Ligand binder design. Structure first.
Ligand SMILES: CC(=O)SCCNC(=O)CCNC(=O)[C@H](O)C(C)(C)COP(=O)(O)OP(=O)(O)OC[C@H]1O[C@@H](n2cnc3c(N)ncnc32)[C@H](O)[C@@H]1OP(=O)(O)O
Ligand SMILES: Nc1ncnc2c1ncn2[C@@H]1O[C@H](COP(=O)(O)OP(=O)(O)OP(=O)(O)O)[C@@H](O)[C@H]1O
Ligand SMILES: C/C1=C/C(=O)O[C@@H]2C[C@@H](CC[C@H](C)/C=C\CC1)O[C@@](O)([C@@H]1CSC(=O)N1)C2
Ligand SMILES: [Ca+2]
Lengths: 180, 370, 138
């Protein structure tokens, strides 16, 4: 019983830059970090991946309902890494998170991608509810500017008696994936 | 889960810091590497840093914490890094992997203290330290070749094989832009003018950057300058006074090829390039001659590329192919190379993490960064 | 046995070759990855690695099991470091790889990373293995 009723769209940040500020406000409310960095990370969004998608609502201005970042995956042309999935705090529990992820799948599939990957710990059941499974680690490809080169016999003593499943603070994290 | 922060890139020069974000194509901040202090007479603060010291340089004495590419004043250098993070970039250093640059042949104890300060004072999560010349090569779209890095305090010949500097063949020359500025002041004063102050020094630096060039045939250019006025140019000072400059235009950067002009008895950058190449593995020498890369503000003189092609040509065997590459962007190519390296897929394994530093100590830098 | 170290060095998949070599009195390859390069290190190659002419191989290069390599850093006989970093040499654009050689009381620990793997990672791994065996008076 979480049936979103609001009219929503899903657009890249770099096509609605007047909302970049509102997007930064949204994400930094969940994951506080320097506003200089959040504005820069959203400023990297581009059609070349990584790109940041905003779930937006008609109605003074449009509301930035939710955001998710999509990056390409090293050695996996058909994989996308999903990160920074968040719905506005005051709008959680209205189905906007389900629509955000489902819209991600549509967006990715239209462009030929067939596997989404992400990490979580406390929200594992949120993703399994939407079809995700436990998978293995991938490495996302970070933003590089369009202007950069882009061309690059005695016996042995005793023995000393995958950091990819760990995150920024040394916690274990679930790698989850989904075919689309 | 939240995406990981983008890495910072900080290129510490003797004259200029260039700082920005890994992946961008140009630093967001470029500011002078200075700390100023009151000449005589609270005032406001015990010290003034970077852009602030610049704006107040009238009431201040300036210190350069980096001399000839080597950090020599660690308390003031700490002040510079603090200014970079919080004042110039406006980021939290504890949130970003930080890529620093070092001068070729940086002493061991220096890069140990660099790692120590970044981890223990600024609480970075991870960091790396790269050779400036190597980054310049990456910026030129290459991984092997010899780089000529001439900035404000030091000039180096750095031969590089597959992205790894070859220290045994690095050649250092304590002559760079600041010395050339001093030299131009001197001979302009010998021309009837008077440039003798630190402020007048900055003025002469602008004169040097906007009107000097490297002659292709020095003795022939001197003759032309004595025979006519075609090479004379004028410069308007901030007070409306106008000076005119003749053969000084190309006598000044000629020092790079004839250090004896400034009283140094040492080889010119062409001879040093050649000696560097000859100290390298035979099998790669040809790749060096064909990938002579220029970096640093002091290589931006009009005519330097053609002239070092000529000189190298005359020093090298008669069949060697020689190519001199001078990217138009080489004021900042060291930083651009850092942006590249820190954005590469192969780099995630290269960072020194806070946890590698806790276990191994500052010595870890000697094992992971070269 | 000694082969239990080759695997202990091969386990993380970062390296394509590894070996433990004795350099005292008469050099022998104690353990190595079969079918690779280090397994065939010759006593003359050891002698060059541990010899006194620390200058010639800079312009001449050196060989490890016959593979031509270029010397990047040489600290193999200087106390506290006991390490040497190299990069292989190839023909016709074939990939090259990073090599690190560390020296202990009786053995040379050799590691060659696979394509793309940074030489500082190989250096760390080799240094830690060498420190373990020095700790055990090897
Ligand atoms: C913690 C990590 O490591 S990864 C975390 C991913 N991002 C975040 O946690 C940011 C903070 N949280 C949020 O932004 C939101 O709570 C989100 C994006 C996780 C979910 O968005 P919401 O709007 O709150 O949930 P929504 O209303 O769309 O519910 C959609 C479905 O998922 C269910 N659901 C929502 N949250 C959870 C949850 N934490 N656990 C299990 N199920 C959940 C709902 O019951 C609902 O069921 P249904 O639609 O099939 O009937
Ligand atoms: N167009 C130009 N022509 C001549 N010289 C220039 C020009 N632009 C900058 N410079 C010189 O380059 C110098 C600064 O260059 P750069 O930033 O590469 O040096 P740095 O990195 O600060 O110092 P280091 O020598 O330690 O690298 C100054 O001395 C300046 O005079
Ligand atoms: C425009 C500019 C160029 C530069 O390279 O800046 C550096 C750093 C500067 C510090 C003092 C100056 C008053 C402050 C800022 C000038 C920065 O010293 C320099 O001018 C020095 C002294 S003279 C010279 O040629 N190089 C160059
Ligand atoms: Ca520099």
């Amino acid at each position: 019983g979480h049936m979103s009723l609001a009219e929503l769209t899903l657009e890249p940040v770099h096509r609605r830059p007047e909302l970049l500020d509102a997007c930064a406000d949204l994400i930094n409310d969940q994951w506080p970090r320097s506003r200089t960095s959040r504005l820069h990370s959203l400023g990297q969004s581009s059609d070349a991946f990584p790109l940041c998608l905003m779930l937006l609502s008609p109605h003074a201005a449009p509301v930035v309902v939710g955001h998710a970042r999509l990056s390409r995956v090293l050695n996996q042309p058909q994989s996308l890494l999903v990160e920074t999935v968040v719905v506005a705090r005051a709008l959680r529990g209205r189905g906007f998170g389900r629509r955000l992820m489902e819209g991600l799948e549509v967006f990715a599939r239209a462009r030929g991608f067939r596997k989404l990957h992400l990490t979580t710990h406390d929200q594992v059941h949120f993703y399994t509810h939407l079809g995700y499974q436990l998978g293995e680690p991938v490495q996302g490809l970070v933003f590089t500017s369009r202007r950069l080169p882009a061309t690059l016999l005695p016996p042995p003593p005793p023995l000393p008696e995958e950091t990819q499943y760990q995150n920024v603070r040394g916690r274990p994290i679930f790698w989850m994936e989904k075919d689309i | 889960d939240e995406d990981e922060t983008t890495a910072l890139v900080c290129d510490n020069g003797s004259g200029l810091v260039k700082a920005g974000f890994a992946g961008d194509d140009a630093p967001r901040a470029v500011f002078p590497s200075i700390v100023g202090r009151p000449r005589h007479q609270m005032g406001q603060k015990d010290s003034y840093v970077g852009d602030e010291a610049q704006s107040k340089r009238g009431i201040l004495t300036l210190k350069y914490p980096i001399e000839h590419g080597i950090i020599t004043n660690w308390d003031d250098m700490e002040k510079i890094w603090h200014h970079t993070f919080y004042n110039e970039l406006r980021v939290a250093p504890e949130e970003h992997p930080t890529l620093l640059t070092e001068a070729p042949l940086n002493p061991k104890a220096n890069r140990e203290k660099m790692t120590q300060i970044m981890f223990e004072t600024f609480n970075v999560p991870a960091m790396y330290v790269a050779i400036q010349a190597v980054l310049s090569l990456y910026a030129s779209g290459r991984t092997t070749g010899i780089v000529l890095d001439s900035g404000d305090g030091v000039t180096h010949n750095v031969p590089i094989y597959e992205g790894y500097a070859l220290p045994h063949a690095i050649m250092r020359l304590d002559l760079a832009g600041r010395d050339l500025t001093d030299y131009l002041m001197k001979i302009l004063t010998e021309r009837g003018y008077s440039f003798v102050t630190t402020a007048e020094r900055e003025i002469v630096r602008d004169i040097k950057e906007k009107l000097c060039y490297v002659a292709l045939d020095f003795e022939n250019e001197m003759a032309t300058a004595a025979s006519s006025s075609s090479l004379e140019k004028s410069y308007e000072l901030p007070d409306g006074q106008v000076i005119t400059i003749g053969n000084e235009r190309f006598r000044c950067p000629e020092t790079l090829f004839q250090p004896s002009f400034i009283g140094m008895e040492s080889a010119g950058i062409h001879e040093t390039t050649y000696n560097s190449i000859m100290k390298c593995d035979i099998d790669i020498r040809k790749d060096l001659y064909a990938n002579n890369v220029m970096s640093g503000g002091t290589t931006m003189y009009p005519g330097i590329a053609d002239r070092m092609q000529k000189e190298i040509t005359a020093l090298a065997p008669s069949t060697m192919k020689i190519k001199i590459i001078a990217p138009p962007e080489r004021k900042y190519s060291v930083w651009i190379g850092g942006s590249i390296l820190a954005s590469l897929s192969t780099f995630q394994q290269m960072w020194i993490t806070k946890q590698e530093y806790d276990e191994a100590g500052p010595s870890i830098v000697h094992r992971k960064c070269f | 046995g000694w082969n239990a170290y080759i695997d202990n060095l091969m386990a993380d998949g970062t390296c394509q070759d590894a070996a433990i070599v004795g350099y005292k009195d008469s050099p022998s390859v104690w353990a190595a990855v079969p079918g690779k390069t280090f397994v065939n290190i010759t006593p003359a190659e050891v002698g060059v690695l541990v010899g006194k002419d620390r200058s010639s191989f800079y312009v001449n290069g050196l060989t490890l099991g016959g593979q031509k390599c270029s010397v990047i850093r040489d600290s193999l006989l200087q106390d506290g470091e006991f390490s040497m970093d190299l990069r292989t040499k190839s023909t016709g654009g074939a990939p090259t790889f990073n090599v690190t050689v560390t020296k202990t009381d009786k053995t040379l620990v050799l590691l060659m990373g696979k394509e793309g793997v940074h030489g500082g990672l190989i250096n760390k791994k080799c240094y830690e293995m060498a420190s373990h065996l020095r700790r055990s008076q090897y």
